[PDB]
């Protein structure tokens, strides 16, 4: 590597020394990709080595095996696991690919060419060559669209994906007739992010999921071809900054938005994150608790539509602000929760009284009781329950872990976007190192501020 | 040539000649904020009682309904609404819009937009003045704290009623109930936040005492030392070498800041990163990650429970928990 | 305490963001000389900004 | 206490405020 005097960047900003070095940039990137696939494979092997079959995966502290099981590998009806060999194969393949990527990144970092422009014109680039940056972006867009279409092919012809909305408690379903209608697909995008709408977190069926994936894959492929065969327009060239730190800041803002959004999926969505693998959500656990105590007091010979609470609002069933029949108590705030075990009990006017009385199911009751016992309430010592609870239960929801970690990473990366966008603007401007001391802009304009 | 209306408006907006810089971030910062201040003053003065818990038990919160300044607070939104969006047009009448806590959502949304665009405007003026732009990066920590206590915690708990009430006694109620729920005192992120504000006070006193102690004698004892400093001067006003030597023989020689740039960077970075950590602690508690749980940890050879200070903290948490929202719980487990 | 923490953070950020060039190097921390009688951050620019 | 506190608040908001105004105007009228 280089030093402080030859580059002007200190060791704690050493990667800035490889801003203009394309070969070392590529080496750092490939070594980092090797690190990411290494974590994927190593965590997969660790989780399958620490996997217990007679327990649900949300009690065992796993986050990658639920991801693989959602795609429908080694799982059967009801969310039960049938084989861990697909997870083991995925982990081993990721470890080998990580070895390959790490070798490539290390080779380019150490003895790879320093600059690719004078010897490899296809891979050479300067940060102001907007055409070449759009070509690289187009290639990556083709790769992303191919990956989305690969997921689509997996859910269509390659065993399908796990449907938690299947009758009986969910099963590995083959997707038939994906909803490719632009209106319903993009109504998620132009939706409000508040309660009752939830923006794209409230996607409730694999048909819309696969339709949106088909749409995003086709859009990404056409956008990649467009970027390969076009150049940024003059309005975009006037509006944007064309430095490497600027491009990094744009990517940082984007991935911060994705981190916050994925935190919201992990906390609220139970379709792309099935509850049989990730545990119940907050609303799901509260509604499961209310429904379990509902059926308990119904078995104990107590009227459920009547028999109001101490506030006269309803102990078991009452009215939502819109007017639907919802579960009583503080779980009113979770009246928009939709799960596989409430929908058969829900009619046109919300929770039907006759359906809740006679159309009950033992599997629904068992799932609700298990979700009530396993709410996403825990300490960072992995102590189940609220903060007052005794150190006796070793469980914290994977949904809670994913949401906390991803919101943290999204916020740090938003601040990183702030830092890099400001430094990119100041570096393109010319005063990123300070004030010129002979051309102070404040003294060039009049007093009184 | 700057004659067209949009060019003139753009030059006026980006003008650094104004008393307060507006900018393209200010064109959102100003109207959203003035909306928030207007409705906040009006609600704090004459807001009718708000049914916060959703149990048809309203809370006054406003001065004209019998509140003083400490007890006066804009009450959060009704629990029946939860995370639903409740603007005035989504209500049939202003009476029920005020009864259900709509002003709280309007103030919170406008305040979040206002602080975000205030941070953007801080960057914009740093850009238009030829300055380094990380003042907004420093200001990202109180913005993170406000977002965590006004939006992120209501998102994690599923109800805007769960946010921090816009007041003082409401703030204390939020903190007490929050301790009951999550045991925030036993959390590392909150511990780093407390260490950050304590160290921020310590370092503010340290830096101010070192600089004010080392000012160059340019006046007499019958006139204020501030009169020795002339604005716009280039000559230094204090002895950096004397201050650094005093600090070095006070605490440690090789562990002292001999460079003012590194010293001021440390002063900037310490409370900012600690407030980042505590805001993220609140946001992780929003998804119920909670603090350290050491209830019944020390056990003797016969298995009897040996209580500790964490068990006394558990007793405090129980005392808060059995009393918070005393009529809003029809069931034992507090999962909402 | 909250005002003191605010003052510490805002003073550090203001000083570090209103610095003079003194550069020929991207790291400003090596752009400082202890034995000098000149200010390294623009008080005028800081006052105008705030 | 409903009006004795009012009198105390009034005296507190005027007497040092008036004193500060005396000193401020005594300085402002001198150049």
């Amino acid at each position: 590597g280089r030093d402080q005097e030859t580059t002007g960047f200190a060791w704690w900003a050493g990667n800035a020394r490889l801003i203009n070095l394309s070969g070392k940039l590529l080496g750092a990137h490939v070594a980092h990709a090797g690190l990411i696939v290494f974590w994927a494979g190593a965590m997969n092997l660790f989780e399958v080595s620490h996997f217990v079959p007679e327990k649900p995966m949300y009690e065992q502290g796993l986050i990658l095996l639920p991801h693989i099981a959602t795609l429908g590998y080694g799982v059967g009806p009801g969310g039960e696991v049938l084989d861990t060999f697909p997870y083991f194969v995925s982990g081993v393949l990721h470890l080998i690919s990580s070895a390959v990527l790490g070798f490539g990144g290390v080779y380019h970092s150490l003895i790879g060419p320093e600059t690719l422009e004078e010897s490899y014109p296809f891979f050479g680039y300067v940060w102001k060559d907007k055409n070449k940056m759009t070509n690289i972006l187009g290639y990556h867009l083709i790769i992303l669209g191919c990956g989305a279409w690969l997921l689509v092919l997996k859910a269509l012809y390659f065993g399908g994906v796990y449907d938690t909305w299947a009758p009986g408690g969910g099963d590995v379903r083959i997707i038939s007739n994906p909803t490719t209608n632009a209106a319903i697909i993009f109504g998620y995008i132009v939706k409000s992010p508040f309660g009752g709408d939830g923006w794209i977190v409230s996607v409730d069926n694999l048909e819309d999921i696969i339709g949106g994936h088909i749409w995003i894959g086709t859009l990404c492929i056409l956008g990649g071809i467009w970027h390969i065969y076009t150049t940024p327009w003059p309005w975009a060239r006037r509006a944007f900054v064309w430095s490497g730190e600027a491009y990094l800041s744009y990517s940082l803002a984007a991935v911060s938005l994705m981190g916050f959004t994925a935190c919201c999926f992990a906390w609220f969505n139970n379709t792309a994150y099935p509850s049989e693998f990730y545990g119940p959500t907050g609303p799901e656990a509260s509604q499961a608790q209310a429904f379990t105590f509902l059926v308990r007091d119904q078995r104990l010979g107590a009227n459920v539509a009547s028999a109001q609470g101490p506030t006269g609002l309803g102990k078991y069933l009452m009215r939502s602000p819109t007017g639907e029949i919802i579960f009583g108590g503080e779980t009113m705030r979770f009246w928009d929760f939709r799960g596989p075990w409430v929908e058969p009990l829900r009619g046109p006017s919300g929770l039907d009284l006759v359906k809740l009385k006679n159309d009950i199911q033992p599997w629904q009751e068992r799932r609700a009781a298990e979700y009530m016992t396993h709410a996403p309430l825990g300490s960072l010592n992995s102590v189940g329950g609220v903060a007052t609870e005794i150190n006796a239960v070793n469980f914290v929801s994977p949904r809670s872990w994913l949401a906390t970690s991803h919101f943290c990473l999204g916020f740090f990366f938003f601040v990183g976007h702030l830092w890099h966008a400001g430094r990119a603007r100041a570096a393109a401007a010319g005063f990123e190192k300070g004030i010129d001391r002979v051309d102070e802009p404040v003294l060039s304009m009049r007093p009184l501020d | 040539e700057n004659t067209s209306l949009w060019a003139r408006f753009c030059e006026w907006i980006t003008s650094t000649e104004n008393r307060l810089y507006i900018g393209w971030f200010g064109v959102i910062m100003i109207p959203t904020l003035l909306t928030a201040i207007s409705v906040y003053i009006i609600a704090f003065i004459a807001a009718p009682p708000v049914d916060i818990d959703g149990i048809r038990e309203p809370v006054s919160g406003s001065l004209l309904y019998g509140n003083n300044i400490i007890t006066g607070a804009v009450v959060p939104t009704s629990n029946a609404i939860g995370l639903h969006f409740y603007p005035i047009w989504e209500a049939a009448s202003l009476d029920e819009w005020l009864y259900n806590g709509g002003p709280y959502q309007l103030v919170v949304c406008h305040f979040f937009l206002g602080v975000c665009c205030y941070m953007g405007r801080e960057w914009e003026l740093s850009y238009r003045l030829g300055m380094r732009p990380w003042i907004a990066v420093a200001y990202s920590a109180p913005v993170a704290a406000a977002t965590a206590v006004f939006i992120i915690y209501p998102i994690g708990q599923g109800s805007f009623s769960d946010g921090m009430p816009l007041g003082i006694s409401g703030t204390f109620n939020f903190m007490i109930v929050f301790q009951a729920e999550h045991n925030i005192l036993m959390h590392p992120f909150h511990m780093f936040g407390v260490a950050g504000v304590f160290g921020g006070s310590l370092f503010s006193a340290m830096h101010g005492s070192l600089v004010t102690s080392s000012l160059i004698r340019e006046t007499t004892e019958n006139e204020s030392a501030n009169a020795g400093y002339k604005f716009g001067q280039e000559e230094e006003t204090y002895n950096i070498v004397a201050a650094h030597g005093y600090f070095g023989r006070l605490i440690f020689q090789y562990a002292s800041f001999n460079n003012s740039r590194s010293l001021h960077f440390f002063l900037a970075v310490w409370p900012v990163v600690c407030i980042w950590l505590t805001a993220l602690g609140i946001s992780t508690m929003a998804f119920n990650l909670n603090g350290f749980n050491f209830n019944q940890s020390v056990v003797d050879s016969n298995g009897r429970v040996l209580n500790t200070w964490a068990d006394i903290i558990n007793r405090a948490n129980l005392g808060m928990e059995v009393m918070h929202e005393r009529n809003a719980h029809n069931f034992p487990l507090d999962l909402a | 305490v909250l005002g003191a923490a605010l003052l510490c953070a805002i003073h550090g950020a203001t000083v570090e963001n209103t610095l003079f060039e003194d550069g020929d190097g991207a790291n400003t921390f090596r752009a400082f000389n202890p034995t000098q009688a000149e200010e390294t951050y623009s008080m005028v620019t800081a006052n105008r900004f705030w | 206490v409903n009006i004795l506190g009012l009198t105390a608040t009034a005296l507190f908001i005027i007497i040092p405020t008036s004193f500060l105004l005396i000193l401020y105007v005594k300085t402002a009228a001198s150049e």
């Binding site: 007093p447 009184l448 501020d449 | 008393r19 003065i45 001065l63 004209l64 003083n68 300044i69 006066g72 002339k230 604005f231 716009g232 | 005028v44 006052n47 | 409903n2 009006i3 009012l6 608040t9 908001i13």
Partner: peptide, 30 residues
Amino acid sequence: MEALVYTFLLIGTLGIIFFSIFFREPPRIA
């Protein structure tokens, strides 16, 4: 009768903020 005292104290406080912001002593830069 207490509410009017509170509102008067706060509007006086906002008046002092507006006064300090907009009618401050200009820096002399001399």
